[PDB]
Design a protein around this ligand. Structure first.
Ligand code: NA
Ligand code: NA
Ligand code: NA
Ligand code: NA
Ligand code: NA
Ligand code: NA
Lengths: 307, 307, 307, 307, 307
């Protein structure tokens, strides 16, 4: 076979779509193999720019097609390079930009912990005709973490493994496995903005909903509860426009549902408290002293849902 | 004719547009037929990469154009392969990405049951010059269902049928039918997020609207009803921004309309209850005891609209 | 001249932009003319696939360029076909997708009645060098009307006419008219969702605004009117986000403006009713009995604005 | 030099981005110059379709590149024509679509008065090698003004002028000026929808804010003022979603800010009126009679801000 | 090596994405070097238009590839020029449009101070084979600052420096540094619209929240506080839709959080004031006199958070 050493450069990672489970990675790719010696002009290596590689391909020069497994569509390939040493080795350099898919679980959304995965595999040649010797990833673009959405933790890991296809055994007897390169890039979401702007006003609004039990008029308590329900609906629509469109509930959504249930339970308990009277002589005071038990129950519910 | 065996690979399915009735499917397509024997270099099969297929086409090699019937525009074709065995058989491999249309009914929106349909047909050659022998679809990319919007149920089905065009009989006497391949992929929408975040707060808000009959002041009942109407408008706009823009009402929209009607009926009944007095001496109490009949009537209306 | 018979296929129509007055039409186009006889290989007709038409064009084969007059930019041309009979006739087949402009009036928005117009004209050749014999449009893709936004009524009409350009008389003495094909496709908007979700809650909210006159406290009437005004603002923003961005008011916008005016008139009349007293002894009762005349006046205003 | 007569056709103008200061213009461009005589086949002029112009360019035919100065990126060039008379003159025809930038001031937004400017200049040849003789613009596509966003007033004006570059004097001694064509197209925004749907409900809401002084309870006046403030916030968010994202305030924004200030001043004056009492015996009546001076002051403020 | 003089023209700068940290720059690039003398037709320099440069490249003419380091994908290259003097010097001119990344800190969002950075470096040739002599940037397009989002302050600065790559030492012994050109363009955000439409109504709403302490009824104070909380939620959602989606809080977000905390503290203090009574005989008056200390405390908090 032919040994190919791959170097992958990463510039900057963006375009995370939560519903589509795609993210955009921009950077360079460097591929280097060894071929037959050629007589280049001069002792210096010969270099071929963009839109001149096709002339050498039509001449008969052998270059492989290293596609990305998890990319959708085609990557936006920029400038391409093809530098030919006279002693035999060929270095291929190109710049790409594409949307890459992954599993990308989003439970515990403000405190996410997910990895960006890049997969590389030759589109044409199998293990017996093309191998990957080693890959050194270059995630050198590391800057201050305070103004970035994603916190890159540690250094990216690389692995080389063989992938066997079951459907290639129909026409190919013993050569049906392909060399694949997988690169994992760990990242942690920045939780400062979400914690400061979403979690804390939920706590303040939920405490405001707890505040309704300190009143003395039943009808005015009902109107206060309906105003609190409208406030919770308004904050729910405020969160849902800014939060992404992932197909399952987060901690914020569970907090919103728990607040809805708390308002409904408050309405039911004050209605039951006003109409516990035998003949209208009893006061709604004995069961109305849940002002120091209802927030403790909600805190217990919160501690249950976190764990 | 020429027999062609087609293999269709599916990577991941996304981009469902409810108004446009389109969805995006990414994957590979493999086409294999048999031709005249050729003298390739060596006993190994000859393989042709991307942007070199056109040279063989200009040379005189016969390849067909297998278009997708239901795609809009043109698919984003990635890397293409053309591998030539010396004993005669030709294998064509390509990767595509495009938006495919379907019927895609969206009634009962949180509990959808719809199929993704891929259609394949040669753009040029009819039944007497090109046939499809068989197709084996490979929907092997199956993962955990908990973090996906669509639940792939079962295995995708394939069918080969002939489609006859009426307009081709003007110039073609007896050869006017085309071999078509149709692939059905069943899917079920994930209902957990919608049921937890939309259906339940509608029930809580509708119960809060039922709660207005437990008051004792007519004017305060009117103000409570207007506050409840504003709350229902707020939740309606909260749902309509997050719910898709399908051109007909769902179960959630019917629930919202029923809540609007319930508030209007509550307003009309309390107005009629206050002004049923002959000379202002009667109390609004006899007809106001619909507090345990109005929710039962709404539940009956709901049971009617579900069935 | 050369006679050309055009067949236009329509797949599905979507992408209606109300502000841009554009819509997207996908389908096929078939052009057929007659040329000099040629010696094709065998008695069977010779067929040319995609990206091989240019070789025959460079050889000297005459094909025209049939552009769309009302399209913006360039259509997304898919696979193209070029089939050469040996007795002389040439059949050209292609698939397109583009955004087509029209007048597209949107007054009476929920009950629209507008036509989709496709225009075809040769980009290069005039009447003396190219003619259109006839066109048969194929709008065969007709399905159930219940789940579609647009109701296709009847069958599409076709017309062939000559268009004369005034600016071509500077260099061309007597040949300045071009053969043009115009295809009209009638369509009616689906009014069920709009009528169920927008018109009816406007009626309910306007009746709720009528309900304010049944109170007995002037200050509480003012607060009720301000709450109703906030509700109408909320529903106005609910409609304006979902309704399109056409540059003029619809029936829904006129209803919203009339509701605003009704609330303002209610506020002015109750203010005048409270302060019609000579020395504070009169009751606001005689002029406050417009509870059964104000809705009739609003219904008269509605009947005026519909007609 | 070589004289070139340019004809510019305009189809329809759309895509106005207020923040980006770009607009989309679709139409044709016709360029005509005179060259050496050639022997075309027959006495009829020879015509070259799309994707065959490059063959004549490679042969040695001289065509210039007429770029647009104010376009961003590249225009979406459709079909191109190249018609060669045998007596010498060459006519070049092409269709374009691109986004053109301008100054495009947006102060007095509902009553805008701005011009669309198209600039043309050869990309390669200066005044001594290429000149523009004259341009006749064809804005013939004029229709009814009632259903269009922009009112085209008058006929478009054209001007031919020379533009001198300072940086070209380093290598070019006396030939550093370029012939430029500038076309001005005047347009007026349609004010009917904005005046009916935004300005009038602002007046109604501001009158509703004026209505708070007619009450008799200080606390109820405060609650009414807070409800009016919430209504003004709701209408502000209703306007800001539909109004464009221009980086400075319009008349509507100034009206909204003035309404905010009016509510704040009303709150401050009623607070001062309640607490002007020496020992709680005075009534808030003498300074509370600004009910017929505060709207006059707001009208004076409005008349100041308009002028 | 070969000396290359670069001239960069800037047309207009737009498309600032706060989350993606990208901005769009349109303009020209001019590259000039010196090569071997050639015999052009005539004493005039020979000029090569678009889509004819590739013929000279295939002939053997040496042109470099000057890529942008910080661009994502590929720039939208418009018309390209290649003008060949007969005495030896080559001038290359091209027009580009692309999205360029930067650090682009957004703290103190209404009063931003950030620089637009353009980086240029040859994609292929190192310092020993290609050098940049000097660059003169032309930011001549300066207009009135009143109608622009970004205020260009001063003149753009240019710098030429060498960038050494560590990974190129594996195959290249002593030639591993690349000549890079960096251009800084300073800009200041326009603060007039933000200050007039966001900061001032926050102050008015916060003063309205301060106004709640002037009441005399505890329950009515609670309802006023809940209405103020709903108003603050409404204004928060009004700001968050118009403000960008940067991943950290701005001054406006800190003001909103401080207003939430002020409302919660007001609720807690009035609840504590009503229930400081030993047996219900005390009045909530002594601690309720924080009406002239709570705004001073909030102003102190604001002065702390600004500094
Ligand atoms: Na009240
Ligand atoms: Na709202
Ligand atoms: Na929105
Ligand atoms: Na909204
Ligand atoms: Na309220
Ligand atoms: Na509200």
């Amino acid at each position: 076979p032919v040994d190919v050493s791959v170097s992958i450069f990463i510039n900057k990672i963006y375009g995370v779509n939560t519903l589509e489970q795609t993210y955009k990675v921009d950077g360079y790719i460097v591929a280097q193999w060894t071929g037959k010696p050629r007589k280049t002009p001069g002792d210096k290596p010969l270099i071929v720019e963009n839109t001149q590689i096709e002339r050498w391909i039509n001449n008969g020069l052998w270059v492989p097609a290293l596609e990305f497994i998890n990319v959708v569509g085609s990557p936006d390939t920029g400038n391409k390079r093809l530098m030919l040493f006279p002693d035999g080795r060929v270095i291929y350099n190109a710049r790409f930009l594409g949307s890459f898919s992954n599993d990308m679980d989003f439970r515990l959304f403000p405190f996410d912990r997910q990895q960006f995965v890049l997969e590389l595999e030759p589109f044409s040649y199998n293990n017996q005709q093309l191998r990957f010797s080693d890959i050194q990833v270059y995630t050198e673009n590391i800057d201050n973490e305070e103004i970035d959405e994603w916190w890159i933790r540690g250094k990216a890991s690389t692995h080389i493994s063989d992938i066997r296809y079951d459907h290639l055994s129909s026409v190919q007897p013993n050569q049906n496995e392909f060399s694949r390169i997988t690169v994992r890039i760990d990242a942690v979401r920045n939780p400062s903005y979400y914690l400061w702007s979403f979690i804390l006003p939920l706590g303040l609004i939920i405490a405001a909903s707890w505040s309704v039990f300190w009143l003395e008029s039943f009808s005015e308590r009902l109107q206060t509860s309906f105003t609190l329900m409208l406030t919770v609906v308004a904050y729910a629509f405020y969160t849902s426009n800014i939060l992404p469109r992932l197909p399952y509930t987060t901690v914020i959504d569970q907090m919103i549902i728990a607040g809805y249930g708390s308002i409904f339970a408050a309405i039911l308990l004050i209605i039951f408290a006003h109409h516990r009277q035998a003949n209208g002589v009893e006061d709604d005071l004995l069961i109305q002293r849940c002002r120091l038990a209802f927030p403790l129950g909600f805190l217990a519910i919160g501690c249950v849902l976190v764990i």
